[PDB]
Design a protein around this ligand. Structure first.
Ligand SMILES: [Zn+2]
Lengths: 334, 265
């Protein structure tokens, strides 16, 4: 019942409350940092007006002669991965959901699918209104053009998937209502406000923030679902999850590519502070909200996986590892 | 029809279309079947530049009349806000259709370029108009969008009708031309690329006729015919001033009927 859920949540209450504490004093450590670096940040926001990525190129009109092969090729790579929800075979899924999965498994997959749906539009804005709009180079535009479109198909997949395992309208209701009362939600909100929504923020910094959102904030969910591919279940889900993970991996990689073209890059200290805080909120999800034990996973190995994914990201930004851990999940070798 | 426009402005609030959809987390129990089926329809037609062969298609280009080469030049050079409309349409169904449309527009912008490249050589030197992009005729096109869409004093239903003009009326001349030049064996490539864009452009125009159709408060029947005509004038213009028929009127009427009006021509 909710008895076991408390037992499990309790196994990591001390570890969890630490991350919480750690994250609590970030809204303050940040205003301080900003208060004391006003002169420097003011110069960065200025030079931003000199970054090739962030400014039009009126001499370029042919729109073809590949100036940024790295990007375009990224876009083409994406453009060749087009896929639809109509390709997902769920026929054999509803059976597995009722005959091979326990009540704890369904309770985990459900909430996990719900988290996905609770953030399929919030990110729609970031990609455009706070990104695509900027970056005055066509290659990148094409990419973001295609990303937003693919993200709309991911949003469909989550609803479709949820609409197949959780048909009962009432339950689907409680599902989200119970998913809106999770501390992590606000915590993620605060993080955003700190590195994305807050004015006087650098493009370069948002890039790391965006990438964190794409390759760190859900890494655990994607991981927890390949864990089902192992036990040989929910091929409808694990198929879609595999495709979406590939997609997100790609979008992240793209963030790192643009980053590399920036003349003035964010202090590695800041790049690490952004990715690291993400990792803490992510872990917290599985140490507070949904315990991986619910589906036979080891709390400790999950943390490691997240920390691994961040380090892998940190490195794709020029920074150096921070957790230096190794990938615990062999199945995530991909 | 001045006073009544004031009422529609206050009425646009009862439009469930422009209204909120909040609280709908899961989206599959579809609320907008019509626009959704429209989105599925364009999603199924997804194509790319790679699916187009211009090789052994460039043979029939340099064999064209000395000036027929100049035509295509501008035709491509020309071709080579959806976000605002998408921002007003409050639902997953509509925004999905829009996200797809701008996505496809970039592929058109690529295929077009490829032609400019495989035909008029890498150098954009041959393309004349490319240097004088902002020339009279376009300024008139830009004014139209500056009249019904950009202008603050405008209504959603109106902006919709204008948008369709800009989507279906306008470049109708272009396709009409290439359908000719690609009539019977000549240039199989530009032919498929054209057949497609025209098909999708048609759908993108219909989508606005579909939204409009679901509007509870339609604008005055005269303003509609007043918006189309202007675009038909701005169309005939450069369509017969850039390079060397009255096909526009035909289309102009079908669209007129599309919004529930009388055929003006
Ligand atoms: Zn993405």
């Amino acid at each position: 019942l909710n008895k076991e859920l408390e037992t499990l949540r309790e196994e990591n209450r001390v570890k969890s409350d630490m991350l919480k504490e750690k994250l609590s004093k970030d809204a303050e450590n940040h205003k301080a940092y900003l208060k004391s670096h006003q002169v420097h940040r003011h110069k960065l926001k200025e030079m931003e007006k000199e970054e090739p990525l962030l400014n039009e190129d009126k001499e370029r009109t042919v729109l073809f002669p590949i100036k940024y092969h790295e990007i375009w090729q990224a876009y083409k790579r994406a453009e060749a991965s087009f896929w639809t929800a109509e390709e997902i075979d769920l026929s054999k899924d509803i059976h597995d959901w009722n005959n091979r999965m326990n009540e704890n498994e369904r309770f985990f997959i459900s909430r996990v699918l719900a988290f996905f749906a609770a953030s399929d539009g919030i990110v729609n804005e970031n990609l455009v209104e706070n990104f695509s709009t900027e970056v005055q180079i066509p290659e990148a535009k094409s990419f973001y053009g295609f990303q937003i479109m693919i993200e709309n198909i991911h949003s469909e997949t989550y609803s479709l998937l949820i609409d197949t395992y959780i048909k009962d309208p009432k339950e689907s209701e409680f599902l989200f209502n119970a998913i809106h009362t999770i501390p992590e939600i606000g915590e993620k909100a605060e993080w955003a406000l700190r590195w994305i929504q807050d004015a006087d923020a650098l493009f370069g910094e948002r890039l790391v923030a965006f990438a964190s959102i794409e390759g760190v904030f859900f890494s655990g969910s994607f991981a927890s679902i390949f864990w089902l591919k192992k036990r040989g279940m929910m091929p409808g889900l694990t198929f879609s999850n595999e495709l979406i993970c590939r997609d997100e991996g790609l979008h992240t990689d793209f963030a790192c590519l643009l980053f590399a073209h920036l003349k003035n890059k964010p202090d590695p200290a800041i790049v690490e502070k952004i990715v690291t805080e993400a990792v803490e909120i992510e872990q917290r999800y599985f140490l507070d909200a949904l315990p991986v034990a619910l589906l036979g996973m080891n709390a400790d190995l999950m943390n490691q996986y997240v920390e691994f994914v961040a380090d892998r990201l940190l490195v794709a930004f020029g920074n150096k590892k921070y957790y230096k851990v190794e990938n615990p999940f062999d199945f995530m070798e991909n | 029809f001045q006073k009544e426009r004031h009422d529609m402005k206050e009425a646009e609030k009862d439009e469930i279309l422009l209204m909120e959809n909040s609280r709908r987390f899961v989206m599959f129990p579809i609320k907008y079947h019509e626009i959704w089926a429209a989105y599925k329809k364009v999603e199924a037609s997804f194509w790319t530049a790679e699916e187009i062969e211009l090789a052994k298609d460039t043979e029939d280009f340099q064999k064209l009349t000395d000036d027929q080469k100049t035509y295509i030049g501008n035709l491509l050079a020309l071709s080579i806000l959806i976000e605002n409309f998408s921002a007003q349409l409050q639902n997953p169904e509509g925004k999905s259709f829009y996200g797809f449309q701008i996505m496809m527009e970039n592929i058109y912008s690529e295929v077009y370029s490829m032609m400019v490249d495989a035909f008029f050589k890498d150098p954009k030197n041959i393309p004349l108009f490319k240097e004088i992009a902002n020339l009279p005729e376009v300024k008139h096109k830009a004014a139209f969008i500056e009249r019904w869409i950009s202008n603050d004093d405008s209504l959603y239903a109106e902006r919709l009708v204008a948008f369709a003009a800009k989507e279906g009326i306008f470049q109708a001349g272009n396709y009409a031309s290439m359908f000719w030049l690609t009539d019977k064996k000549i240039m199989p490539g530009l032919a498929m690329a054209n057949r497609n864009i025209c098909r999708d452009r048609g759908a993108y125009t219909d989508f606005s006729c579909l939204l409009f159709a679901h509007l509870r408060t339609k604008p005055n029947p005269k303003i509609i015919e007043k918006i189309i005509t202007e675009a038909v004038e701005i169309e005939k213009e450069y369509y017969s001033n850039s390079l060397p028929h009255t096909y526009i009127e035909f289309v102009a009427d079908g669209l007129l009927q599309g919004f529930g009006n009388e055929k003006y021509y």
